[PDB]
Ligand binder design. Sequence first.
Ligand SMILES: C[C@H](c1cccc2ccccc12)N1CCC(C(=O)NCc2cccc(F)c2)CC1
Ligand SMILES: [Zn+2]
Ligand SMILES: [Zn+2]
Ligand SMILES: [Zn+2]
Ligand SMILES: [Zn+2]
Length: 300
Amino acid sequence: RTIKVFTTVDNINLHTQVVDMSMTYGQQFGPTYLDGADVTKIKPHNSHEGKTFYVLPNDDTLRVEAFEYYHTTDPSFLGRYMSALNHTKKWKYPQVNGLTSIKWADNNSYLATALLTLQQIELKFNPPALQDAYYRARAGEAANFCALILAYCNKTVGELGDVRETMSYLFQHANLDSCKRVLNVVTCGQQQTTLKGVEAVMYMGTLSYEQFKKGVQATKYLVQQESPFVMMSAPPAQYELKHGTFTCASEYTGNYQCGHYKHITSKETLYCIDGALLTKSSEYKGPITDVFYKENSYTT
Ligand SMILES: C[C@H](c1cccc2ccccc12)N1CCC(C(=O)NCc2cccc(F)c2)CC1
Ligand SMILES: [Zn+2]
Ligand SMILES: [Zn+2]
Ligand SMILES: [Zn+2]
Ligand SMILES: [Zn+2]
């Protein structure tokens, strides 16, 4: 007639529940999840004894636990998170060239590119959930991390995606306090701008950091930079990537609707990771759209 299970919103604060085995999880707790799976319309099974189930933050204390773990106020988050998990737990996360990648599935090229990128850039997350999941991802267990990335990016599994937007959302939940950017426009008169938060490390309209320092078009040029990396993005275009001149890059092949992402890293030679696939070469030219670089500080 009963079993003892645990209910949680963060899988940190576990709450003991006695569950009647004659009623579904849905009737007793509302939407209920077991490792991403929806058990709402399912009655308890004997194998569920002792197991931890996700519920939704329907009171105030659960909302606070959810905020302090996910740094989110969105109630659907948990639900969306769970959905992603149920799929991303079945993905494969092989090591390629010393990095955790994703075997291709559900149109996830942009997630694999973003993940490899994050692993090659100095970035600490703010939300405890992201910290724990990213730690586990770097160790080859990236299911939770990817499901969370989907959840924060308000994207569902199987849906094509943009790496630059993904990095945008991620950086918003990252510690960029030590970052600052300063630019100028050369319109009559001095027009210096200081940029903080995401816009201190992201730029759209050229792949070339050095061009950003020389100026793009009125002309705008980088006066000062304090960050551990930078991301230079531009609409996909033919571009040459020379070993040692960059850290990594996103290649996009296709049109605005249907496309494919590959990842270019600068180790000893140029490496190209495409999910589980890996190739090497001495040089590379192709359609690039994001290029990452390592900076500590810059002054024009
Ligand atoms: C980096 C690239 C991009 C960025 C900027 C301009 C682009 C022009 C043409 C093609 C790609 C361009 N980016 C790649 C991923 C794209 C994407 O997620 N497409 C999904 C999609 C699916 C259906 C309709 C749609 F408008 C968009 C969005 C665009
Ligand atoms: Zn509690
Ligand atoms: Zn059964
Ligand atoms: Zn906090
Ligand atoms: Zn699936």
